[PDB]
């Protein structure tokens, strides 16, 4: 059971290796592509307000 202390001290180099893991995995580019769901969006339209038809003569 004392072997755990020896293993930790011996394998401590994996700490620096893990530091490299994380601090270059952050450097590497990742992009979680959140979707649009199966249900699709849509806006009304380009709508502009104006005065209606005028009865000229």
């Amino acid at each position: 059971a004392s072997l755990i202390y020896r293993q930790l001290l011996t394998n401590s180099y994996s700490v620096d290796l893990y530091d490299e893991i994380e601090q270059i995995g952050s450097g590497k580019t990742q992009n979680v592509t959140i979707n649009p769901g199966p249900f699709a969006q849509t806006r009304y339209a380009p709508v502009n307000w104006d005065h209606g038809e005028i009865n000229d003569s």
Binding site: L17, A40, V47
Partner: protein, 486 residues
């Protein structure tokens, strides 16, 4: 020969995000990509009584790609892939300034900072709609929290500026990002539309430490403006550091080396305590292993085991067989744990006493040294097997003896009877080989107990004879130390 110099400074880091936009065709309703882009920034600030000029560069990673697309109709609103930053995304801020510290940033022993967090909030973007109600991007915020400083470099137009890179984490904040006048509300996160909110600069303040390793060949005379950059540094010649390491054996001691050799040396015990830079203290151990794997000795281990496995299913005359099994015994010594004094113990002791009194100066070079010594140290060595008080001893050069334990007089050798026992009975490294042992017994007549101990290569008896100042053992171990010449 390499002196620590602390350069800790309190700095103010000003930076701004970079925004790139690409329009999609039609009449001007859609958009193709809204994304973060690398952004430079210049400024000046007063600190410690002088105006220091600083140059920063912000970049983003881990970015999400939300979307929104009103359909294939040629006027319906949408943004095909509009980004945001949230939990996953990081932001780097490379920082540089004209102060003296950044000239001495080539070699570093340690480097870490303490910066105060900040809250970045998104601006208001009015998407360029030609007609109608005006869509409104607004809201969204994150918080930059510092996590870790590293080295980096701006590839600036005029030169490449060595610099410090600050990796800030993120934390989404209260204002729910929305696409108002549109179908996206109560998101959270900082989108790429207007990350700066019109602010001239986002600001951080903190203190960063640094321990540079400016060189020194004389105590009184320490430099400024480290200018031995890797343009000014070049590969030290292989034969040159071979000669240096060979010269280093001028000084090694006799008994202290054995005292060191009687330690269990592991990865941490050896490779710690090396006056090295940060970039090499990070992965020195793995660097050593990578070139240790491909060494001639290591591939010989691999060939031995693979040849035995293939054999498992395949089914001066004496000098050649003795030499081949001597190489095999050397391989077995390296792979297994022998209970003797184990020549590779002495090899590792010499290796540690050599490398401890050196320095890493921008190149690791423990690869090509550790792995090279592992194969070259003690070229001609000797092993022995005791049985029935008739110990058979073998030399890697091919020589062979077989002599009694109670009295050291040799006997005719028995090839193929030594080979049956060398496979299973434990091999004993012969650091006190037969010739020196015979000299010792003849001159300093020894007893049965210490005879057996020296045959077994017992550290207790070996150190007893060394501390007796026995000339025979002293000289023998001195030659042992002297073959360690790479």
């Amino acid at each position: 020969l390499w002196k620590e110099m602390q350069y800790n400074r309190d700095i103010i880091i000003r930076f701004k995000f970079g925004n790139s936009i690409v329009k999609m065709g039609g009449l001007g309703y859609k958009w193709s990509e809204i994304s973060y882009k690398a952004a430079n920034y210049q400024y000046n600030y007063l600190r410690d009584g002088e105006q220091v000029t600083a140059h920063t560069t912000c970049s983003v990673n881990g970015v999400n790609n939300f979307s929104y697309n009103g359909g294939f109709l040629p006027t319906d609103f949408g943004i095909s892939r509009y980004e945001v930053i949230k939990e996953n995304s990081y932001v780097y801020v490379d920082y540089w300034d004209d102060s003296k510290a950044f000239r001495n940033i080539v070699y570093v022993r340690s480097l870490a900072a303490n910066l105060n967090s900040v809250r970045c909030t998104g601006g208001s973007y009015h998407f360029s709609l030609p007609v109608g109600a005006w869509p409104v991007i607004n809201g969204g915020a994150v918080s930059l929290h510092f996590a870790g400083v590293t080295l980096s470099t701006q590839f600036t137009d005029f030169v490449s500026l060595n610099s410090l890179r600050f990796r800030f984490s993120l934390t989404v904040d209260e204002p729910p990002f929305s696409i108002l006048r549109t179908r996206t509300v109560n998101l959270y996160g900082l989108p790429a539309a207007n990350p700066n909110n019109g602010n001239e600069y986002y600001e951080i303040s903190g203190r960063f430490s640094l321990i540079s390793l400016v060189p020194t060949n004389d105590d009184y005379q320490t430099p400024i403006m480290n200018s031995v950059t890797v343009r000014q540094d070049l590969e030290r010649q292989l034969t040159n550091l071979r000669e240096e390491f060979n010269s280093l054996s001028q000084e090694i001691a006799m008994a202290q080396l054995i005292d060191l050799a009687l330690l269990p040396l592991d990865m941490f015990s050896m490779f710690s305590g090396i006056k090295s830079t940060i970039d090499l203290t990070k992965s020195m151990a793995t660097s050593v292993m990578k070139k240790f794997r491909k060494s001639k000795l290591a591939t010989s281990i691999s060939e031995m085991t693979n040849s035995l496995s293939d054999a498992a299913s395949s089914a001066n005359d004496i000098s050649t067989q003795t030499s081949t099994i001597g190489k095999k015994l050397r391989l077995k010594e390296m792979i297994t744990q022998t209970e003797g004094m184990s020549f590779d113990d002495i090899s590792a002791a010499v290796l540690k006493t050599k490398i401890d009194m050196s320095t890493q100066i921008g190149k690791n070079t423990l690869p090509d040294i550790v792995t090279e010594a592992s194969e070259k140290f003690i070229p001609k060595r000797s092993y022995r097997i005791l049985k029935d008080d008739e110990v058979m001893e073998i030399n890697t050069e091919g020589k062979f003896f077989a002599y009694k334990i109670n009295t050291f007089d040799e006997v005719p050798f028995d090839v193929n009877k030594f080979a049956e026992l060398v496979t299973d009975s434990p091999v004993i490294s012969a650091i006190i080989d037969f010739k020196t042992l015979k000299n010792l017994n003849d001159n300093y007549g020894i007893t049965r107990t210490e005879a057996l101990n020296l045959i077994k290569s017992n550290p207790n008896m070996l150190r007893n004879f060394i501390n007796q100042n026995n000339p025979i053992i002293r000289n023998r171990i001195e030659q042992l130390i002297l073959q360690c010449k790479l």
